[PDB]
Amino acid sequence: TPVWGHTQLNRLSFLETVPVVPLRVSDESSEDRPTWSLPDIENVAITHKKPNGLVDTLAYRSVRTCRWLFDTFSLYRFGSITESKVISRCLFLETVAGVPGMVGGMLRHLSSLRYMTRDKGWINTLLVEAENERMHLMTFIELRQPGLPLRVSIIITQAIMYLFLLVAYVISPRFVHRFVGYLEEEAVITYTGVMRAIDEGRLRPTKNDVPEVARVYWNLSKNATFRDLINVIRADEAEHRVVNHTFADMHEKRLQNSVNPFVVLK
Amino acid sequence: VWGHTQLNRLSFLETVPVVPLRVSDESSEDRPTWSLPDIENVAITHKKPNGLVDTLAYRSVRTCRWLFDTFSLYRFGSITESKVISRCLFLETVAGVPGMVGGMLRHLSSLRYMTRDKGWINTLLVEAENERMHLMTFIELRQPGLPLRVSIIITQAIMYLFLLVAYVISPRFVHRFVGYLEEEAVITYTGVMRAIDEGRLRPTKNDVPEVARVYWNLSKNATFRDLINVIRADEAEHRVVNHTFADMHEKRLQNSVNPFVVLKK
Numbered sequence: 138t139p140v141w142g143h144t145q146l147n148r149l150s151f152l153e154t155v156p157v158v159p160l161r162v163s164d165e166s167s168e169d170r171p172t173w174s175l176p177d178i179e180n181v182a183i184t185h186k187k188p189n190g191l192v193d194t195l196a197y198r199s200v201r202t203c204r205w206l207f208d209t210f211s212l213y214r215f216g217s218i219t220e221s222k223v224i225s226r227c228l229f230l231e232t233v234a235g236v237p238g239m240v241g242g243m244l245r246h247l248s249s250l251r252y253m254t255r256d257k258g259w260i261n262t263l264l265v266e267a268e269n270e271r272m273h274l275m276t277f278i279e280l281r282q283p284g285l286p287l288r289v290s291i292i293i294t295q296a297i298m299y300l301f302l303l304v305a306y307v308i309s310p311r312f313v314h315r316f317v318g319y320l321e322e323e324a325v326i327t328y329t330g331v332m333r334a335i336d337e338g339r340l341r342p343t344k345n346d347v348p349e350v351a352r353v354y355w356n357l358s359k360n361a362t363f364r365d366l367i368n369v370i371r372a373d374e375a376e377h378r379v380v381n382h383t384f385a386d387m388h389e390k391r392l393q394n395s396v397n398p399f400v401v402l403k
Numbered sequence: 404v405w406g407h408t409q410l411n412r413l414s415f416l417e418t419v420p421v422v423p424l425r426v427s428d429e430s431s432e433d434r435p436t437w438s439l440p441d442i443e444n445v446a447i448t449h450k451k452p453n454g455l456v457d458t459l460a461y462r463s464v465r466t467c468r469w470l471f472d473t474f475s476l477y478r479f480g481s482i483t484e485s486k487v488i489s490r491c492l493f494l495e496t497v498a499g500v501p502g503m504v505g506g507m508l509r510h511l512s513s514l515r516y517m518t519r520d521k522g523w524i525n526t527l528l529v530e531a532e533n534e535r536m537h538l539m540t541f542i543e544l545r546q547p548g549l550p551l552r553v554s555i556i557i558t559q560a561i562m563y564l565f566l567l568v569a570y571v572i573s574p575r576f577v578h579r580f581v582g583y584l585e586e587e588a589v590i591t592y593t594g595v596m597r598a599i600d601e602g603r604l605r606p607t608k609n610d611v612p613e614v615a616r617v618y619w620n621l622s623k624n625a626t627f628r629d630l631i632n633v634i635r636a637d638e639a640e641h642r643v644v645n646h647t648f649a650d651m652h653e654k655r656l657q658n659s660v661n662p663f664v665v666l667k668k
């Protein structure tokens with residue numbers, strides 16, 4: 138269908154159409170949407186992959202070290218579970234889950250560009266992750282819109298974590314791939330916790346008007362609940378878990394410059 | 404069957420030796436869909452410098468071109484096919500950079516500020532994947548020397564850092580610079596097409612590479628000329644797209660909706 142041809146290609150600008158384009162939520166993201174079956178991802182589960190040497194271990198300790206600081210500073214520990222404290226958590230953390238796949242994608246892109254070699258499907262995997270995690274932010278910001286302290290600390294988090302991820306990937310992209318491996322091992326835990334807690338009525342959900350952004354992106358029928366939204370977000374993290382653990386492994390074996398195994402499922 | 408059982412496995416390393424190399428996976432699934440006789444009337448345009456920033460973006464490129472052409476010897480002697488491919492190989496390394504840094508910075512901005520991005524990221528990201536496909540194509544038709552492989556490495560560094568600070572200081576200027584660059588590219592890519600029609604240039608690569616034939620949806624009959632003709636249209640999509648995006652900045656419209664994402668749907 139698209140009416141994009143040479144009369145449009147010889148234009149100077151389309152600045153003028155800008156005021157008459159609708160803001161339909163589906164545009165927020167590309168069409169590489171994830172498609173999960175609620176009854177199948179329902180049985181997603183908590184795994185843990187053994188660290189192989191020093192770098193796998195450094196990686197695993199840092200994620201533990203961070204889970205522990207975060208969990209304590211943020212008071213997630215004592216008090217009952219709450220809607221408020223779940224989404225506030227997911228909101229802040231989702232800002233930093235978006236970074237990794239954009240540094241890997243972006244650097245593997247640049248490498249492809251300077252030794253003029255073929256990437257074999259790695260770049261388009263990482264950037265859909267980055268995107269897919271950015272859409273995790275976009276959903277929770279429909280649910281809780283935070284205030285000035287939490288926002289200022291999100292900005293300093295990105296400054297710090299952009300710098301670490303960036304310079305970690307240049308020196309050991311296995312490290313960073315291992316690190317998201319384990320990062321997501323914790324993401325999966327935290328979310329099955331939230332579903333379990335709904336199922337045992339300890340956190341019975343108030344936000345069931347699932348946002349339009351999330352309905353389009355996960356193709357969810359109108360009658361979907363917070364628990365159904367959460368699960369799918371948890372299913373996404375199990376994928377990333379396997380992808381960054383498969384990617385780390387591949388490096389360990391010196392298979393960086395080999396086909397991205399997840400291209401086949403497509 | 405991509406479900407829990409696959410998501411609950413730890414690693415898919417054992418699958419690497421059983422997955423085959425396919426040209427269709429070297430990019431995403433967002434491919435140019437051109438029809439040759441339509442895109443034969445792409446054309447050289449020039450946007451008016453609207454103000455001090457544009458004038459600076461334009462005068463940078465014009466000097467980059469003058470310098471590069473006297474230093475590369477483009478104009479010295481006759482057009483040859485080695486001289487065209489040499490050049491476009493060099494330059495198409497540089498060209499993949501801008502969309503990526505742009506795409507990245509905007510991604511980053513939606514995360515820290517928690518704001519809709521409204522279609523820019525992807526367009527700016529497939530824009531980088533496109534230029535890299537041009538590049539993967541040109542690596543098939545020539546494999547450059549050691550001298551040039553070094554010249555290409557160091558030039559990434561200067562250019563990467565340049566756009567990094569440029570896009571943080573002023574995205575208006577970058578998009579314009581990019582818009583202007585892609586005027587010049589269409590000029591070159593028409594000089595070439597015209598050189599073929601005249602017989603001043605007789606390509607020998609009128610076997611077009613596999614990567615390119617499924618990236619662009621061409622036939623095994625299509626030639627060098629036809630390849631230069633789908634690429635040129637890519638360079639004119641980035642010409643408009645980018646001059647529009649930079650008009651959106653000049654007007655404080657850089658957080659409205661990217662208009663092209665309707666111009667598809």
Ligand SMILES: C/C(=C\Cc1c(O)c(Cl)c(C)c(C=O)c1O)CC/C=C(\C)[C@H](C)O
Nearest residue numbers: 203204207227230231234320321323324327
């Ligand atoms: C391992 C951690 C939390 C588990 C966890 C979650 O519980 C959730 Cl809910 C998500 C989304 C993720 C996403 O990765 C996630 O990693 C602590 C990470 C702390 C930092 C990175 C510091 C503050 O910079």
Ligand SMILES: C/C(=C\Cc1c(O)c(Cl)c(C)c(C=O)c1O)CC/C=C(\C)[C@H](C)O
Nearest residue numbers: 467468471491494495498584585587588591
């Ligand atoms: C020669 C130049 C421009 C013409 C031109 C072309 O002739 C071509 Cl063939 C293309 C593809 C493009 C793509 O954008 C292109 O811009 C100068 C480019 C900049 C440098 C060399 C240094 C890094 O600053």
Ligand SMILES: [Fe+3]
Nearest residue numbers: 234321324374
């Ligand atoms: Fe994650």
Ligand SMILES: [Fe+3]
Nearest residue numbers: 231234270273
């Ligand atoms: Fe996430």
Ligand SMILES: [Fe+3]
Nearest residue numbers: 495498534537
């Ligand atoms: Fe190009």
Ligand SMILES: [Fe+3]
Nearest residue numbers: 498585588638
């Ligand atoms: Fe270009």
Ligand SMILES: [O-]
Nearest residue numbers: 234270324374
């Ligand atoms: O996440």
Ligand SMILES: [O-]
Nearest residue numbers: 495498534588
């Ligand atoms: O280019």
